[PDB]
Design a protein around this nucleic acid. Structure first.
Ligand SMILES: [K+]
Ligand SMILES: [Mg+2]
Ligand SMILES: [Mg+2]
Ligand SMILES: [Mg+2]
Ligand SMILES: [Mg+2]
Ligand SMILES: [Mg+2]
Ligand SMILES: [Mg+2]
Ligand SMILES: [Mg+2]
Ligand SMILES: [Mg+2]
Ligand SMILES: [Mg+2]
Ligand SMILES: [Mg+2]
Ligand SMILES: [Mg+2]
Ligand SMILES: [Mg+2]
Ligand SMILES: [Mg+2]
Ligand SMILES: [Mg+2]
Ligand SMILES: [Mg+2]
Ligand SMILES: [Mg+2]
Ligand SMILES: [Mg+2]
Ligand SMILES: [Mg+2]
Ligand SMILES: [Mg+2]
Ligand SMILES: [Mg+2]
Ligand SMILES: [Mg+2]
Ligand SMILES: [Mg+2]
Ligand SMILES: [Mg+2]
Ligand SMILES: [Mg+2]
Ligand SMILES: [Mg+2]
Ligand SMILES: [Mg+2]
Ligand SMILES: [Mg+2]
Ligand SMILES: [Mg+2]
Ligand SMILES: [Mg+2]
Ligand SMILES: [Mg+2]
Ligand SMILES: [Mg+2]
Ligand SMILES: [Mg+2]
Ligand SMILES: [Mg+2]
Ligand SMILES: [Mg+2]
Ligand SMILES: [Mg+2]
Ligand SMILES: [Mg+2]
Ligand SMILES: [Mg+2]
Ligand SMILES: [Mg+2]
Ligand SMILES: [Mg+2]
Ligand SMILES: [Mg+2]
Ligand SMILES: [Mg+2]
Ligand SMILES: [Mg+2]
Ligand SMILES: [Mg+2]
Ligand SMILES: [Mg+2]
Ligand SMILES: [Mg+2]
Ligand SMILES: [Mg+2]
Ligand SMILES: [Mg+2]
Ligand SMILES: [Mg+2]
Ligand SMILES: [Mg+2]
Ligand SMILES: [Mg+2]
Ligand SMILES: [Mg+2]
Ligand SMILES: [Mg+2]
Ligand SMILES: [Mg+2]
Ligand SMILES: [Mg+2]
Ligand SMILES: [Mg+2]
Ligand SMILES: [Mg+2]
Ligand SMILES: [Mg+2]
Ligand SMILES: [Mg+2]
Ligand SMILES: [Mg+2]
Ligand SMILES: [Mg+2]
Ligand SMILES: [Mg+2]
Ligand SMILES: [Mg+2]
Ligand SMILES: [Mg+2]
Ligand SMILES: [Mg+2]
Ligand SMILES: [Mg+2]
Ligand SMILES: [Mg+2]
Ligand SMILES: [Mg+2]
Ligand SMILES: [Mg+2]
Ligand SMILES: [Mg+2]
Ligand SMILES: [Mg+2]
Ligand SMILES: [Mg+2]
Ligand SMILES: [Mg+2]
Ligand SMILES: [Mg+2]
Ligand SMILES: [Mg+2]
Ligand SMILES: [Mg+2]
Ligand SMILES: [Mg+2]
Ligand SMILES: [Mg+2]
Ligand SMILES: [Mg+2]
Ligand SMILES: [Mg+2]
Ligand SMILES: [Mg+2]
Ligand SMILES: [Mg+2]
Ligand SMILES: [Mg+2]
Ligand SMILES: [Mg+2]
Ligand SMILES: [Mg+2]
Ligand SMILES: [Mg+2]
Ligand SMILES: [Mg+2]
Ligand SMILES: [Mg+2]
Ligand SMILES: [Mg+2]
Ligand SMILES: [Mg+2]
Ligand SMILES: [Mg+2]
Ligand SMILES: [Mg+2]
Ligand SMILES: [Mg+2]
Ligand SMILES: [Mg+2]
Ligand SMILES: [Mg+2]
Ligand SMILES: [Mg+2]
Ligand SMILES: [Mg+2]
Ligand SMILES: [Mg+2]
Ligand SMILES: [Mg+2]
Ligand SMILES: [Mg+2]
Ligand SMILES: [Mg+2]
Ligand SMILES: [Mg+2]
Ligand SMILES: [Mg+2]
Ligand SMILES: [Mg+2]
Ligand SMILES: [Mg+2]
Ligand SMILES: [Mg+2]
Ligand SMILES: [Mg+2]
Ligand SMILES: [Mg+2]
Ligand SMILES: [Mg+2]
Ligand SMILES: [Mg+2]
Ligand SMILES: [Mg+2]
Ligand SMILES: [Mg+2]
Ligand SMILES: [Mg+2]
Ligand SMILES: [Mg+2]
Ligand SMILES: [Mg+2]
Ligand SMILES: [Mg+2]
Ligand SMILES: [Mg+2]
Ligand SMILES: [Mg+2]
Ligand SMILES: [Mg+2]
Ligand SMILES: [Mg+2]
Ligand SMILES: [Mg+2]
Ligand SMILES: [Mg+2]
Ligand SMILES: [Mg+2]
Ligand SMILES: [Mg+2]
Ligand SMILES: [Mg+2]
Ligand SMILES: [Mg+2]
Ligand SMILES: [Mg+2]
Ligand SMILES: [Mg+2]
Ligand SMILES: [Mg+2]
Ligand SMILES: [Mg+2]
Ligand SMILES: [Mg+2]
Ligand SMILES: [Mg+2]
Ligand SMILES: [Mg+2]
Ligand SMILES: [Mg+2]
Ligand SMILES: [Mg+2]
Ligand SMILES: [Mg+2]
Ligand SMILES: [Mg+2]
Ligand SMILES: [Mg+2]
Ligand SMILES: [Mg+2]
Ligand SMILES: [Mg+2]
Ligand SMILES: [Mg+2]
Ligand SMILES: [Mg+2]
Ligand SMILES: [Mg+2]
Ligand SMILES: [Mg+2]
Ligand SMILES: [Mg+2]
Ligand SMILES: [Mg+2]
Ligand SMILES: [Mg+2]
Ligand SMILES: [Mg+2]
Ligand SMILES: [Mg+2]
Ligand SMILES: [Mg+2]
Ligand SMILES: [Mg+2]
Ligand SMILES: [Mg+2]
Ligand SMILES: [Mg+2]
Ligand SMILES: [Mg+2]
Ligand SMILES: [Mg+2]
Ligand SMILES: [Mg+2]
Ligand SMILES: [Mg+2]
Ligand SMILES: [Mg+2]
Ligand SMILES: [Mg+2]
Ligand SMILES: [Mg+2]
Ligand SMILES: [Mg+2]
Ligand SMILES: [Mg+2]
Ligand SMILES: [Mg+2]
Ligand SMILES: [Mg+2]
Ligand SMILES: [Mg+2]
Ligand SMILES: [Mg+2]
Ligand SMILES: [Mg+2]
Ligand SMILES: [Mg+2]
Ligand SMILES: [Mg+2]
Ligand SMILES: [Mg+2]
Ligand SMILES: [Mg+2]
Ligand SMILES: [Mg+2]
Ligand SMILES: [Mg+2]
Ligand SMILES: [Mg+2]
Ligand SMILES: [Mg+2]
Ligand SMILES: [Mg+2]
Ligand SMILES: [Mg+2]
Ligand SMILES: [Mg+2]
Ligand SMILES: [Mg+2]
Ligand SMILES: [Mg+2]
Ligand SMILES: [Mg+2]
Ligand SMILES: [Mg+2]
Ligand SMILES: [Mg+2]
Ligand SMILES: [Mg+2]
Ligand SMILES: [Mg+2]
Ligand SMILES: [Mg+2]
Ligand SMILES: [Mg+2]
Ligand SMILES: [Mg+2]
Ligand SMILES: [Mg+2]
Ligand SMILES: [Mg+2]
Ligand SMILES: [Mg+2]
Ligand SMILES: [Mg+2]
Ligand SMILES: [Mg+2]
Ligand SMILES: [Mg+2]
Ligand SMILES: [Mg+2]
Ligand SMILES: [Mg+2]
Ligand SMILES: [Mg+2]
Ligand SMILES: [Mg+2]
Ligand SMILES: [Mg+2]
Ligand SMILES: [Mg+2]
Ligand SMILES: [Mg+2]
Ligand SMILES: [Mg+2]
Ligand SMILES: [Mg+2]
Ligand SMILES: [Mg+2]
Ligand SMILES: [Mg+2]
Ligand SMILES: [Mg+2]
Ligand SMILES: [Mg+2]
Ligand SMILES: [Mg+2]
Ligand SMILES: [Mg+2]
Ligand SMILES: [Mg+2]
Ligand SMILES: [Mg+2]
Ligand SMILES: [Mg+2]
Ligand SMILES: [Mg+2]
Ligand SMILES: [Mg+2]
Ligand SMILES: [Mg+2]
Ligand SMILES: [Mg+2]
Ligand SMILES: [Mg+2]
Ligand SMILES: [Mg+2]
Ligand SMILES: [Mg+2]
Ligand SMILES: [Mg+2]
Ligand SMILES: [Mg+2]
Ligand SMILES: [Mg+2]
Ligand SMILES: [Mg+2]
Ligand SMILES: [Mg+2]
Ligand SMILES: [Mg+2]
Ligand SMILES: [Mg+2]
Ligand SMILES: [Mg+2]
Ligand SMILES: [Mg+2]
Ligand SMILES: [Mg+2]
Ligand SMILES: [Mg+2]
Ligand SMILES: [Mg+2]
Ligand SMILES: [Mg+2]
Ligand SMILES: [Mg+2]
Lengths: 48, 275
RNA sequence: GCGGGGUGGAGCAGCCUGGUAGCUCGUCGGGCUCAUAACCCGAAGGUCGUCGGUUCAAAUCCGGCCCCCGCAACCA
RNA sequence: CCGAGGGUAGGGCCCGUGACUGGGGCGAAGUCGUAACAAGGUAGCUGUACCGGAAGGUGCGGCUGGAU
RNA sequence: UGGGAGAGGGUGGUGGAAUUCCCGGAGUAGCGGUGAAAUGCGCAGAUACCGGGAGGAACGCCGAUGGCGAAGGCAGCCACCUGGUCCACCCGUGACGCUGAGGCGCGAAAGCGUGGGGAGCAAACCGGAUUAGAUACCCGGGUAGUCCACGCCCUAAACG
RNA sequence: CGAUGUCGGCUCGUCGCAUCCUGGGGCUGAAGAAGGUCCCAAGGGUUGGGCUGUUCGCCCAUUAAAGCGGCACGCGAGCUG
RNA sequence: GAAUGCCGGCAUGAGUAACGAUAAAGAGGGUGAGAAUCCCUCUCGCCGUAAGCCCAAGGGUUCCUACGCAAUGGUCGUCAGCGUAGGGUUAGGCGGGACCUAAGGUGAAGCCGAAAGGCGUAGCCGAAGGGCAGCCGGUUAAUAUUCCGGCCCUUCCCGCAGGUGCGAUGGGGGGACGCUCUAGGCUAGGGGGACCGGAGCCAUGGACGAGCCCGGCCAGAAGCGCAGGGUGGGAGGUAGGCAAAUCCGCCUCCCAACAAGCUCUGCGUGGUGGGGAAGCCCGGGUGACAACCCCCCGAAGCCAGGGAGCCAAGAAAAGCCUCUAAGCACAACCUGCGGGAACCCGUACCGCAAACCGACACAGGUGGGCGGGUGCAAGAGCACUCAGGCGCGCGGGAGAACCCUCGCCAAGGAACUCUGCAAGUUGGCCCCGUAACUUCGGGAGAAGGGGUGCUCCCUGGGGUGAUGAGCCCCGGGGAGCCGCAGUGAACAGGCUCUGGCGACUGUUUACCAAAAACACAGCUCUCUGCGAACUCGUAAGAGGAGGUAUAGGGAGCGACGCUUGCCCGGUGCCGGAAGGUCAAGGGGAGGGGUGCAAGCCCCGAACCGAAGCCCCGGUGAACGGCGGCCGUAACUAUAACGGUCCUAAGGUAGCGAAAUUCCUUGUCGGGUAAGUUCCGACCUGCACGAAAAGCGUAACGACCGGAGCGCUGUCUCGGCGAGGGACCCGGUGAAAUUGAACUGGCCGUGAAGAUGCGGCCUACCCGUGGCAGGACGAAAAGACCCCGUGGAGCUUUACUGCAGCC
RNA sequence: GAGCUAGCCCUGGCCAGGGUGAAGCUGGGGUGAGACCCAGUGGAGGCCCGAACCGGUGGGGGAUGCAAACCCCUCGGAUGA
């Protein structure tokens, strides 16, 4: 049956991407936390 | 008027459509139309704020001239009468001798090929617009401004009419389509005659499909819901209302008046509506 | 199991607040009518379901026993 | 080939009968009222409508086959 | 051909009296209703009076024992459209007539459908009386309906 | 109650005897035939349908008879539901 | 040493289940240490509206080649989407960007909000929509509309020539639009040819033939032809298109009019450039100077912005054309020609799947185009088959029970069972025929029946062509032949009668309910006069609606038909400038503290004083509610009738043992041999009843009842057969569970159901295939029930508070 | 977090073939004129049958599955809410 993951490069970058995070206070505090934790990638990677 | 159908499907039994015989032109004026953005009942928050709306036929909006006092004295020929999907009334296409082209809602008896005019001197003739004070007391009238130069507010729907009953001072007394008696300012314009397409109320939609064409989505009774959805929701089996009949939001829906008590226009309403 | 009830022949008041039983109808006698009904004037008839207790005194307050309605009997 | 007729299928008319039901006629001395005949005690009758235990009542309009 | 009388019919328009409602004034202890009363209405200012307003229906006097219509039926006034009908003249056609099973149309009231309208009236219904009872007559209310438009119904003491 | 699956049916039985039938008896208000009643006896047998989820029961047509109970109201790691 | 503890390790179950679609395999010859599994060949089978081909998304080197087999591959492996290494993706024209706008998003102006932020016209962003210039063939192990070849084209810059009032973001035109149906003419595609080209072929009885087999094109600029689309011309006035305007709009006049002219596409032709089969021979070569033609079928595609009808009335913006304004007319723009210039990103490969979403090389899921032929009425259905692609990554045997999927069955034919559940039956087309009832459409494919192949003969009409031949499309008649059987295979309704419920098509608990539930047109009540009511929001602002009472919100009812009765005492809502109560505030009779005192300071009565509440009326398609007892008729029985108590009023019509009836399988009738169900009635309705609508209703229903016909392995009552498993052999090898176990029966005992205790009985040790009575077998710290002063959802005239409203 | 699912918005796309034959239109009849009837033409519809496509009615299988919802037979819709 149709499952929950239906990849979409545009949907990916526009929802979790760097610019979407930077726009909002909660999105910025995400990047702050993942930077503070040492995450190698602060945002999901997508090809474009 | 009111075209019937033979019962060759279950829904054709009662479905009636307008006869459209007054229409003389079946495609709008390109210069007078603009896209009518369907809202679906969603406001700028994206939230449904008027329930059960959406999914109707695409429509373009006809720019209607609800002023008419800004072309005072310039006569105009009635070029056509056209179907308008944004209103119950028909609309009339005017070719001003000025060369300008405007739409107005088509009053009853209006004939394509006649002239109309607007102003304090206009003949008391179907389709002409004059300040309310210059219109003879007793004549039916439509598309009435509620305040001078603010645009026609009352008696715009198909078949509707307001009658000038009397006047006192700067104000005349109208009987609105509802039967309310209201003082409206004499400088407010109005178009003599009643709005045409009076057969509009005898249309039998015929089936659920026609309400969907009109953009009206299915309405679900409060009694059909659960208590988390509605005062009337729940009960084992069917249940009477079991409290004063209420809306989804709690307020009583049988009789409870809701016009603001201290509204300033109260001073200008002579008698609340009838029936 | 829980609530109410039983009083002239009929249907009901009085019980709660002890001492006084009352209303409409019916019944009986008289009247009017040619006669009946209606109507009018008078009158009779209830020891208050039964027993036991309380009290100076019980239709009335407290227990039974009889009886008559009503309500309940749910989770499996 | 046609062919009495037999078989299968579906119709149409008539007859008999059927729990129950609907009124109808008739029936020496039943119960309820008194609608009509006198102005019958609200003049009657009427087509219709609605209502009521029952006769009937009432509305609308008509008729005189209504008295004084 | 020339004339006449008429609520003949249809459409649109319009006039005054009255009733109710509404508003302003004025005014006070009752009004109303009946056989008698009660219900009802009224000091929260009714009734009775004046002015203003809104709305529906019906047209007093003329009016008659009258007129027109095939009947049902038709009554303020005006204009339009239209039917019948009588008289005159003795001009034209030359029996072209009478009746009429079927058919078609018209058809009071009530009633029905879809809109509208709704003052007064009033089945149903409520109430007050009367009464043994009173699902009545009488009184206070009151919904259809009565009115308009379109479409049905097609009955009658549709009677001379 | 850190679970012992709950009615009825189907399937498969097995047991008890307070015996429905068949076998053996006494008594009879047992003439015969056919019954009644009690005693012995569990070897075998103890039908097919209509109705209802039904067990039960009622009924139809038969029968030598159409027995009654136990087995976690036998039997859902066998089925049905 | 226990915490269903935690982490790890290793056991048990066990050489057990399984090894992932039943489309299927066999041999030969290669390679290699090793081969069912890799390569080649031949044979066999499967898909063929795909299981073939091409795009898009997603994936991201998986592509090609060499080397390789430890792990990955459900077996094997020499093979691979695996390991290692090298190579591979080439564009002005294809897609996106340097163009346009859509929703939406963002947002100079502006607005709002404690902060964060919310909103917002323009503008900007935003595409699978608009717009825009490349077609065919060749080549690589791997890319190609990209490289090459042939033939075309676009824009930018500059220049020459000719022409013109040039010039924009601004004005205008245009772009520009729906649904259904559809004309003419083409193209794609396909069928046929006794014509044309071809390696060959003659078999096994016949055929050297008008034989079989193979192929018979593709692209192309200008021009031309056919087809269509688009489109009036001129003049006078002009106040409108927010300046101007010769443009556009409006008015008049003249001419043009199903035309024509002009213009733009499609198709054809077209210089020219390519392609070119079977077969044979080792991807190639040959065939080959390959041929390259005629007839027919023919689109849903093209001409296109075509046409008609309909209502539900069908984006925007740029490119483009025209107008003019500043400016400028040494300019600038238009047209033609010439030279030059033309950037960034993608391009491999998978792509209905082993490379994408499902933890797997997972029977599932995934949008667009092409999708050939024959026959079956048509078709994308079905059967077979082309091109192409596969046999599904464990096999070999055996021929048990039992399971799955399938085939047949004597006699019976629902006797099965909760139920004909399931499975039969019926089955397409043509013709005959078709009832109650109905809202006149329907019911209807009602029901029921007949026909169906092949051969010969006669003949009717249509398309094309030409009016004929040929090919093709509908037919009509006559005579025959064969078989058990002619839609001979495959795909393709069982029917009827009668109730309940819901009018109907629709909708729904994704993953146990598809229903009578929801919705629905329709009906009514109610609110709302517009800065509407209402809704979201603290707000601004939105929705409502660029709508206006024939409109919008809320509620109930639920097509339609005939109807919808009585109660306003209580609650709700509505109306009511009186009366009563009523807070803050006003008021200040009058007391108090303190001070020498002026004073400062506190308390405080009458009285005035909103909404609300009380009170007075209204109101039911508002919440709701619609009696009891006793008596009475000339047989009995029963009460039309009466008496009395109560109520705010005492259930009207219609219906009724009902989706409602407890007693109950009520009673009677029908159907049955038999009927707790069913249908029709009755009425003492435990406990129907009128918009939580009442009673009906044609049509409809994968709804739920009852019956009949038909037909059946449902059954009496089972039997046989097929295949996939199960069984055996080689390969690979789980799982839950598991205190340890050396783990028998009876009768007892025991915490009351004992392999484990007693007594007795029985019993050599170990397996394998089977069956499920026990191990109170496994699974899940019982969902039921209770307990916890445990939790949550929900309700209200519980308490208290808050939003909102007054 | 709406890459699942629910609704809405914007922009595109899809729905083989066959059947039924509404209005209108034309002609004919009819009438004072009509209504209306008849034939032809026409091609309407939450019409009919049936693939793609969207569903998920009944039954069987599956149940440490091919699969944490699948497979087979059957069945609903398929110009429309
Ligand atoms: K337990
Ligand atoms: Mg899903
Ligand atoms: Mg997706
Ligand atoms: Mg993407
Ligand atoms: Mg994308
Ligand atoms: Mg996206
Ligand atoms: Mg976002
Ligand atoms: Mg982003
Ligand atoms: Mg920010
Ligand atoms: Mg911040
Ligand atoms: Mg910050
Ligand atoms: Mg790093
Ligand atoms: Mg992130
Ligand atoms: Mg109709
Ligand atoms: Mg009809
Ligand atoms: Mg019209
Ligand atoms: Mg525009
Ligand atoms: Mg809008
Ligand atoms: Mg926004
Ligand atoms: Mg929303
Ligand atoms: Mg709303
Ligand atoms: Mg909505
Ligand atoms: Mg409107
Ligand atoms: Mg209109
Ligand atoms: Mg005003
Ligand atoms: Mg309507
Ligand atoms: Mg619409
Ligand atoms: Mg609803
Ligand atoms: Mg509910
Ligand atoms: Mg519910
Ligand atoms: Mg919620
Ligand atoms: Mg709540
Ligand atoms: Mg609530
Ligand atoms: Mg409720
Ligand atoms: Mg409920
Ligand atoms: Mg419910
Ligand atoms: Mg209930
Ligand atoms: Mg209630
Ligand atoms: Mg409420
Ligand atoms: Mg409110
Ligand atoms: Mg009003
Ligand atoms: Mg009393
Ligand atoms: Mg007392
Ligand atoms: Mg006392
Ligand atoms: Mg006494
Ligand atoms: Mg005493
Ligand atoms: Mg309970
Ligand atoms: Mg014979
Ligand atoms: Mg009398
Ligand atoms: Mg009398
Ligand atoms: Mg009466
Ligand atoms: Mg008074
Ligand atoms: Mg006073
Ligand atoms: Mg009025
Ligand atoms: Mg003469
Ligand atoms: Mg009449
Ligand atoms: Mg009274
Ligand atoms: Mg008369
Ligand atoms: Mg356990
Ligand atoms: Mg357990
Ligand atoms: Mg014996
Ligand atoms: Mg025995
Ligand atoms: Mg039992
Ligand atoms: Mg029983
Ligand atoms: Mg015997
Ligand atoms: Mg037993
Ligand atoms: Mg047990
Ligand atoms: Mg028991
Ligand atoms: Mg027991
Ligand atoms: Mg048991
Ligand atoms: Mg089980
Ligand atoms: Mg069981
Ligand atoms: Mg078990
Ligand atoms: Mg320990
Ligand atoms: Mg633990
Ligand atoms: Mg652990
Ligand atoms: Mg662990
Ligand atoms: Mg571990
Ligand atoms: Mg370790
Ligand atoms: Mg280990
Ligand atoms: Mg092992
Ligand atoms: Mg084992
Ligand atoms: Mg296994
Ligand atoms: Mg498997
Ligand atoms: Mg082999
Ligand atoms: Mg091998
Ligand atoms: Mg090997
Ligand atoms: Mg090979
Ligand atoms: Mg094919
Ligand atoms: Mg991957
Ligand atoms: Mg390996
Ligand atoms: Mg190695
Ligand atoms: Mg491996
Ligand atoms: Mg595997
Ligand atoms: Mg090797
Ligand atoms: Mg490569
Ligand atoms: Mg190039
Ligand atoms: Mg550039
Ligand atoms: Mg964007
Ligand atoms: Mg684009
Ligand atoms: Mg578009
Ligand atoms: Mg391009
Ligand atoms: Mg080209
Ligand atoms: Mg090529
Ligand atoms: Mg190379
Ligand atoms: Mg210029
Ligand atoms: Mg420009
Ligand atoms: Mg356009
Ligand atoms: Mg447009
Ligand atoms: Mg062909
Ligand atoms: Mg060419
Ligand atoms: Mg000008
Ligand atoms: Mg050569
Ligand atoms: Mg198409
Ligand atoms: Mg096109
Ligand atoms: Mg349409
Ligand atoms: Mg725009
Ligand atoms: Mg110069
Ligand atoms: Mg030029
Ligand atoms: Mg650049
Ligand atoms: Mg490439
Ligand atoms: Mg697929
Ligand atoms: Mg693959
Ligand atoms: Mg595989
Ligand atoms: Mg797969
Ligand atoms: Mg072919
Ligand atoms: Mg076929
Ligand atoms: Mg295979
Ligand atoms: Mg496969
Ligand atoms: Mg094998
Ligand atoms: Mg074997
Ligand atoms: Mg199979
Ligand atoms: Mg067979
Ligand atoms: Mg055979
Ligand atoms: Mg058989
Ligand atoms: Mg049979
Ligand atoms: Mg048979
Ligand atoms: Mg049966
Ligand atoms: Mg059986
Ligand atoms: Mg069959
Ligand atoms: Mg078949
Ligand atoms: Mg019949
Ligand atoms: Mg018939
Ligand atoms: Mg029938
Ligand atoms: Mg019927
Ligand atoms: Mg019919
Ligand atoms: Mg059919
Ligand atoms: Mg034949
Ligand atoms: Mg043959
Ligand atoms: Mg033969
Ligand atoms: Mg069928
Ligand atoms: Mg339904
Ligand atoms: Mg339903
Ligand atoms: Mg119903
Ligand atoms: Mg209905
Ligand atoms: Mg449908
Ligand atoms: Mg479900
Ligand atoms: Mg669920
Ligand atoms: Mg679920
Ligand atoms: Mg359900
Ligand atoms: Mg369904
Ligand atoms: Mg639902
Ligand atoms: Mg419905
Ligand atoms: Mg209705
Ligand atoms: Mg809010
Ligand atoms: Mg708006
Ligand atoms: Mg309905
Ligand atoms: Mg009917
Ligand atoms: Mg009634
Ligand atoms: Mg009340
Ligand atoms: Mg009240
Ligand atoms: Mg009241
Ligand atoms: Mg204050
Ligand atoms: Mg107050
Ligand atoms: Mg009450
Ligand atoms: Mg009954
Ligand atoms: Mg019964
Ligand atoms: Mg019933
Ligand atoms: Mg029921
Ligand atoms: Mg009941
Ligand atoms: Mg019963
Ligand atoms: Mg019985
Ligand atoms: Mg019988
Ligand atoms: Mg009875
Ligand atoms: Mg209700
Ligand atoms: Mg109910
Ligand atoms: Mg029905
Ligand atoms: Mg249905
Ligand atoms: Mg259904
Ligand atoms: Mg049956
Ligand atoms: Mg049968
Ligand atoms: Mg069998
Ligand atoms: Mg086998
Ligand atoms: Mg091994
Ligand atoms: Mg292995
Ligand atoms: Mg041990
Ligand atoms: Mg041991
Ligand atoms: Mg052992
Ligand atoms: Mg043992
Ligand atoms: Mg014990
Ligand atoms: Mg034991
Ligand atoms: Mg032992
Ligand atoms: Mg022992
Ligand atoms: Mg011991
Ligand atoms: Mg022992
Ligand atoms: Mg033993
Ligand atoms: Mg073994
Ligand atoms: Mg074994
Ligand atoms: Mg066992
Ligand atoms: Mg077992
Ligand atoms: Mg066990
Ligand atoms: Mg245990
Ligand atoms: Mg056990
Ligand atoms: Mg067990
Ligand atoms: Mg479990
Ligand atoms: Mg726990
Ligand atoms: Mg527990
Ligand atoms: Mg649990
Ligand atoms: Mg308990
Ligand atoms: Mg507590
Ligand atoms: Mg406690
Ligand atoms: Mg608690
Ligand atoms: Mg919870
Ligand atoms: Mg998505
Ligand atoms: Mg379709
Ligand atoms: Mg046909
Ligand atoms: Mg036409
Ligand atoms: Mg299924
Ligand atoms: Mg089945
Ligand atoms: Mg499962
Ligand atoms: Mg499946
Ligand atoms: Mg299937
Ligand atoms: Mg279908």
């Amino acid at each position: 049956m149709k499952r929950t993951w239906q990849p979409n490069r545009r949907k990916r970058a526009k929802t979790h991407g760097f610019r979407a995070r930077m726009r909002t206070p909660g999105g910025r505090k995400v990047l702050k936390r993942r930077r503070q934790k040492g995450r190698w990638r602060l945002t999901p990677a997508v090809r474009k | 008027a009111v075209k019937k159908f033979k019962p060759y499907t279950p829904s054709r039994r009662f479905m009636t459509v307008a006869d459209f015989s007054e229409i003389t032109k079946t495609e709008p004026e390109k210069s007078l139309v603009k896209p009518l953005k369907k809202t679906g009942g969603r406001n700028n928050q994206g939230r449904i704020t008027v329930r059960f709306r959406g999914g109707g036929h695409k429509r373009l909006y006809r720019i209607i001239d609800f002023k008419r006092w800004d072309k005072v004295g310039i006569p105009a020929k009635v070029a056509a009468i056209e179907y308008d999907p944004n209103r119950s009334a028909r609309i009339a296409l005017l070719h001003y001798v000025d060369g300008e082209k405007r739409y107005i809602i088509a009053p009853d008896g209006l004939q394509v090929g006649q002239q109309v005019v607007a102003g304090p001197d206009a003949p008391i003739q179907v389709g002409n617009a004059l300040p309310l004070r210059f219109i003879p007391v007793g004549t039916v009238v439509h598309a009435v401004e509620l305040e001078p130069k603010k645009g026609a507010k009352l008696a715009r729907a198909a078949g509707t009419s307001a009658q000038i009953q009397g006047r006192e001072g700067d104000y005349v007394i109208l009987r609105l389509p509802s039967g309310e008696l209201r003082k409206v300012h004499g400088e407010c314009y109005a178009t003599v005659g009643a709005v045409g397409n009076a057969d509009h109320k005898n249309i039998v939609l015929g089936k659920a499909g026609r309400s969907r064409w009109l953009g009206r989505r299915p309405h679900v009774r409060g009694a059909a819901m659960n208590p988390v959805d509605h005062p009337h929701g729940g009960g084992e089996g069917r249940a009477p209302r079991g409290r004063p009949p209420a809306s989804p939001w709690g307020w009583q829906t049988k009789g409870l008046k809701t016009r603001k008590r201290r509204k300033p226009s109260s001073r200008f309403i002579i008698a609340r509506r009838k029936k």
